[PDB]
């Protein structure tokens, strides 16, 4: 692979996961793109020729006929695509308006129809497109200032539900951490029972996690109270009729009697600095 990769890839695998059909015909999927992009990355380290050399030499040694042909064919039409993406001129308008981003996207769509067919366009981009359109759409639903926020929120939820289920599950997975905070902070802002919290957790993460989460709560309580009770003793030493070196020594001694490892000694500084300046200590946000 040292013959195909650039100096920066000398520590990776080749992303070319090209799906062949039940008759050895390249089926264009989202990965087909990833494959090209993989080599394209070499540009900037390589010249445009080497980027072709490498790619061709790789496909030759991996796949045969007929797919081979189709591959290089589509590759050529993809490169000439990359270059022909410079043929999109900036339209005159408030460069921070959807009707802009939309057009800027349209311009590309039209270029794609210059090098690919519906089927190929679908195979190479569809996936990404879904999200792009999802993102664009939201913008217009937010910029539509003829709707109440309560309505916008509704349209957002409705638009979300229109995505292919996959995306919903994935996004919900990528937002799980936030969902946890949301409910943890809501349920606790009105003093719910430990059981309610337990169910809420058991629901979103499961028993196994719930338990370690409970384990964490405790560890934080501890840490928190240690610092709490620590700064109190530090303040007493600060407001004492002693000398600087004596206060620093007393403090040091208190710090070594509660915070042994170098690690805790760092974190402490964080709270120290915040406290000394009358800021709220960072435990909950």
């Amino acid at each position: 692979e040292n013959t195909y990769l650039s100096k920066s890839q000398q520590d990776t695998q080749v992303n070319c996961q090209l799906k062949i059909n039940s008759s050895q015909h390249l089926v264009v999927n989202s990965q087909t793109r990833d494959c090209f992009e993989y080599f394209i990355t070499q540009y900037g380290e390589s010249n445009l020729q080497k980027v072709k050399t490498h790619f061709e030499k790789f496909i030759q040694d991996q796949y045969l006929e007929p797919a081979r042909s189709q591959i290089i064919d589509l590759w050529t039409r993809y490169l000439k695509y990359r270059e022909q993406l410079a043929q999109i001129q900036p339209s005159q308008s408030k460069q921070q308006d959807q009707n802009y981003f939309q057009k800027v996207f349209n311009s590309i769509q039209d270029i794609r129809k210059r090098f690919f067919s519906a089927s190929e366009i679908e195979g190479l981009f569809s996936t990404e497109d879904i999200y792009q359109n999802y993102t664009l759409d939201r913008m217009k639903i937010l910029e539509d200032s003829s709707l109440s926020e309560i309505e916008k929120a509704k349209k957002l939820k409705e638009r979300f539900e229109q995505l292919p289920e996959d995306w919903q599950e994935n996004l919900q997975e990528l937002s799980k951490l936030d969902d946890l905070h949301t409910l943890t902070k809501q349920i606790k802002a009105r003093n719910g029972s430990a059981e309610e919290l337990r169910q809420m957790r058991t629901a979103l993460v499961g028993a196994e996690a719930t338990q370690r989460l409970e384990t964490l709560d405790i560890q934080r309580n501890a840490w928190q109270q240690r610092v709490t009770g620590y700064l109190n003793q530090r303040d007493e030493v600060l407001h004492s009729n002693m000398s600087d070196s004596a206060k620093k020594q007393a403090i040091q001694q208190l710090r070594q009697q509660q915070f042994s490892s170098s690690q805790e000694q760092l974190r402490l500084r964080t709270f120290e600095t915040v406290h000394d300046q009358g800021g709220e200590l960072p435990f909950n946000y």
Binding site: S8, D11, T12, Q13, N15, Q17, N29, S30, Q31, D34, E37, Y38, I40, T41, Y43, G44, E45, L48, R82, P90, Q95, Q96, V104, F105, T127, E128, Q132, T135, R138, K152, A153, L156, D166, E169, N170, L171, E173, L174, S175, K176, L177, D178, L180, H181, E208, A209, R212, L213, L216, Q219, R220, Q263, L266, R267, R269, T270, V274, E280, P282, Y285
Partner: protein, 292 residues
């Protein structure tokens, strides 16, 4: 719905942001809508991705404390011992904070366009002596302020302390912070850092360009600051190439601006430049291949 196992690492992929906007009823103001299609991508490629939502504007230390806890939460939810931290811009020092206080929970640190050696732009804002510049500085600051002021009450209200944030990305602040969390930071002005310390792998890759594609509404702005960052412009527009080197530099010359690094805006970038999404999917492969 995941098609391949190309970015399936052992330990989860955790992304920390920094320096973002007001959280309106969008979805992920400073979350998923920060890393344009990188996350879902790495997700379909078999990875286990978790985005962290820390205070956008605050000291490296406070953000660090915030992040850390989420890290623990994640370790608890995943059941995996260590995590792979990937921070962009201010997220860089923010993951370093966690690395410094919980090296047992950190498998790898990856910083993209991080102002480790500080950012000249940060200094300028704070200047008082330099009356003419200071003018444009205070001014610009007031605007950047106004823009977030336009948001108002943030639903996800994070302790907002911009001054400290600025002081944390300054040439002095970053030095002060380095002196305490020097793991991965170079001793030479523009060399690399340690590849590995305390059993933690460290990687940094950044861009050295301002103007990438004039359709990016922000290139105009980034070009402005690029001159503040460096006259000869060896920067992504905010963070010089030197201040972004940390541990092993995968590559520090992408035709990316400070936002192209996160695939912004909407995926607009130079004509022939590597796709952020694929660069990330490629790094994610290397961590897997490192048994991380």
């Amino acid at each position: 719905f995941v098609y391949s196992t190309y970015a399936q690492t052992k330990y989860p992929l955790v992304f920390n942001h920094g320096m973002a906007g007001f959280n309106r009823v969008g979805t992920d103001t400073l979350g998923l809508d920060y890393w344009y299609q990188i996350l879902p991508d790495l997700a379909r490629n078999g990875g286990n991705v978790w985005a962290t939502r820390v205070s956008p504007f605050n000291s490296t230390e406070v953000r660090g404390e915030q992040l850390a806890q989420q890290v623990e939460e994640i370790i608890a939810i995943t059941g995996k011992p260590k995590v792979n931290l990937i921070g962009h811009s201010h997220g860089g020092p923010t993951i370093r904070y966690v690395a410094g206080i919980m090296p047992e929970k950190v498998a790898s640190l990856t910083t993209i366009g991080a102002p480790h050696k500080g950012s000249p732009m940060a200094d300028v804002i704070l200047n008082v002596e330099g009356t003419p510049l200071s003018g444009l500085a205070t001014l610009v600051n007031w605007f950047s302020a106004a823009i977030t002021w336009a948001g108002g009450l943030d639903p996800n209200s994070y302790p907002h302390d911009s001054l400290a944030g600025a002081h944390s990305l300054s040439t002095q602040g970053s030095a002060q912070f380095n002196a305490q969390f020097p793991m991965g930071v170079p001793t030479t002005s523009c060399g690399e850092g340690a590849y590995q310390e305390k059993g933690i792998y460290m990687y940094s890759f950044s861009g050295n360009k301002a103007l990438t594609n004039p359709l990016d509404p922000f290139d105009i702005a980034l070009t402005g600051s690029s001159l503040v960052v460096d006259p000869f412009g060896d920067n992504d527009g905010l963070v010089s190439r030197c201040s972004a080197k940390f541990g092993k530099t995968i590559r520090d010359d992408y035709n990316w601006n400070h936002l192209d690094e996160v695939n912004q805006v909407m995926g607009i970038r130079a004509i022939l430049a590597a796709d952020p999404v694929s660069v990330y999917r490629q790094h994610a492969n290397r961590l897997k291949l490192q048994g991380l």
